Amino acid sequence: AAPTAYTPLDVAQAYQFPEGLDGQGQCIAIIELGGGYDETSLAQYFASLGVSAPQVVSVSVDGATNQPTGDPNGPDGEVELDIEVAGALAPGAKIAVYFAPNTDAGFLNAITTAVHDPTHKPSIVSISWGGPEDSWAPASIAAMNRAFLDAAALGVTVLAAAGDSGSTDGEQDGLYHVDFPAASPYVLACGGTRLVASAGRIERETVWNDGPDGGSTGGGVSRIFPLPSWQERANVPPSANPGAGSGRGVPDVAGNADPATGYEVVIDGETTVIGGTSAVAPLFAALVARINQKLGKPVGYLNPTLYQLPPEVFHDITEGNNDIANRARIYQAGPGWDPCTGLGSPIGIRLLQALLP
Ligand SMILES: [Ca+2]
């Protein structure tokens, strides 16, 4: 396969992000449950891409703080990857990073604190943290979902990585599981692809699946939320879990996540390649930032609208499956919406165009 890597700009070009728009006037919130970011590596990275470095600021929730541990392989990787990908692509936007303790309550408070923030007023929030929906406490899931509902009502977009361990989401109970908060019908669930592209076009884009050891995109059918009414025409299948219950299909969209075709970033002074679905949420959040800029108002809750747009708005991923546990190939990609890549990778200009009144 020969391992390769792209810079965030390269991917954005492949997905045809709208030119002449950089997030000017927008604020992107990013939730972090641990680690931190150092300004030295951010300045270097933004300088290296020739974009004017966006203002980045940390917010403390329940006493949590921006505390990079210095380990390029730890949580800093998540924090700096999120910041670099979103800022590199929406340099005109202001980035607000919310640090909360790694608990259900901290996660929730971080979310509600950002959504209702009068000082930073974000219109978009990026989430690259989560867990299988079946393991969360019901009360947590209920409160989280409500907060996501409130975000929808207020016109704030919320994106979340669908997970990096295929259809089983890293559990060893023999069942399939989708990840939360991705599972929430109020968040735009971000899946992962293996993208082979040059600036002029996409030579190939398939489901991200490197097996148990390399990871694979989360995706499947929720066991908690029923199929949303606006997703009833997407042909979501019934869960593969004996019982075959119907439910909200994950994800909604997908973008390059395979680390073998990863993103070049600088983590704690270290230049490297990182991937996974957590790179996808910031990727599209900057996409959203550009649309919001062009349009007069925040696009907010996008799901219902996305599922009703014409085929031209998306590059259909039809090859691959996200099964890393067995040979059943559960949740395979196919024509149209699928439990691996949902509607596929968006085409920036066409998405913008479709939403330009
Ligand atoms: Ca498809």
CATH number at residue 357: 3.40.50.200
Taking Cα atoms as reference points, which of 214, 188, 209, 52 lies closest to residue 124? 188
Ligand 1: centre distance to CA 312 (Å): 13
Locus of tokens 């290296």: 48
Characterize the bridge pairing of strands 188-197 and 253-256: parallel
Instruction: State in Å: Cα 344 to ligand 1 middle.
Output: 6
Residues within 5 A (CB) of ion ligand 1: 316, 338
Contacts by residues 232-241 (CB-CB < 8 Å, ≥ 24 positions apart): 233/307, 234/307, 234/336, 234/337, 234/342, 234/343, 235/336, 235/337, 236/337, 236/339, 237/339, 239/176, 240/167, 240/176, 240/328, 240/330, 240/331, 241/175, 241/176
- The helix (run of H) or strand (run of E) holding residue 270 is strand 270-274
- CB 182: neighbour CB atoms within 10 A? 31
**Lookup: tokens for 114:** 């950002």
Residue 308 CB contacts under 8 Å (≥ 6 apart), including other chains = 230
User: Experimental technique used?
Assistant: X-ray
Q: What is the resolution of this structure in A?
A: 2.3
Tokens of 103: 């608990």
> 341 C-alpha to center of ligand 1: Å?
6
Q: Judge whether 303 and 309 are in contact, CB under 8 Å.
A: no
Q: CA 357, CA 347: separation in Å to the nearest integer?
A: 18
Helix-then-strand count for the chain, H and E: 9, 17
Tokens of 100: 């909360």
Cα torsion 170, 174, 176, 181: sign: negative
Task: Give me ligand 1 centre to Cα 207, in Å.
Answer: 9
The question of whether 82 is a catalytic residue gets the answer: yes
In terms of Cα–Cα distance, which of 150, 7, 138, 155 is closest to 85? 7
The question of whether 78 is a catalytic residue gets the answer yes
Q: How far is the CA of 33 from the centre of ligand 1 (A)?
A: 32
Helix spans in the chain (H): 8-14, 39-48, 76-89, 104-115, 138-154, 211-214, 280-294, 303-306, 348-354
Long-range contacts formed by 170-177: CB under 8 A, 24+ apart: 170/132, 171/132, 171/134, 171/135, 175/134, 175/241, 176/220, 176/221, 176/239, 176/240, 176/241, 176/330, 176/331, 177/132, 177/133, 177/134, 177/135, 177/220, 177/223
| Burial bucket for residue 146 (CB in 10 Å: 0-12, 13-18, 19+) | middle
Beta-bridge partner residues of 346: 314
Question: Are the CB atoms for 84 and 130 separated by under 8 Å?
Answer: no
**Interatomic CA distance for residues 124 and 118, integer angstroms:** 14
Give me ligand 1 centre to Cα 317, in Å.
Answer: 4
Identify whether 117 is a catalytic site residue: no
Partnered with residue 154 across adjacent β-strands are none
| DSSP-derived pairing of the beta strands 179-180 and 27-32 | unpaired
Distance, CA of 340 to CA of 255 (rounded, Å): 11
Report the 10 Å Cβ neighbour count for 247.
Answer: 22
Q: How far is the CA of 181 from the centre of ligand 1 (A)?
A: 22
Give the torsion through C-alpha atoms of 65, 70, 71, 74, to 10 deg: 10
Catalytic residue among 76, 80, 82, 205: 82
- Cα of 122 vs centre of ligand 1, distance in Å, is 31
What are the φ and ψ backbone dihedral angles of 249, each rounded to 5 degrees? -90, 135
Q: Which two tokens stand for residue 174?
A: 């023999």
What's the gap in Å between 315 CA and the centre of ligand 1?
Answer: 8
Range of the domain at 285: 1-357
Among residues 78, 134, 268, 338, the one annotated as catalytic is 78
Q: What are residue 160's DSSP bridge partners?
A: 127, 189
DSSP conformation class of 209: B
Length of the chain: 357
Coil, helix or strand at residue 31: strand
Closest CA to 131 of 79, 75, 189, 181: 181
101 touches 62 (CB < 8 A): yes
State the pairing for strand pair 56-60/27-32.
unpaired
From the candidates 216, 239, 278, 345, which is the catalytic residue?
A: 278
Q: How many structural domains are present in the chain?
A: 1
Write the single-letter amino acid at 283. Answer: L
By CB neighbour count within 10 A (0-12 exposed, 13-18 middle, 19+ buried), where does 309 fall? Answer: middle
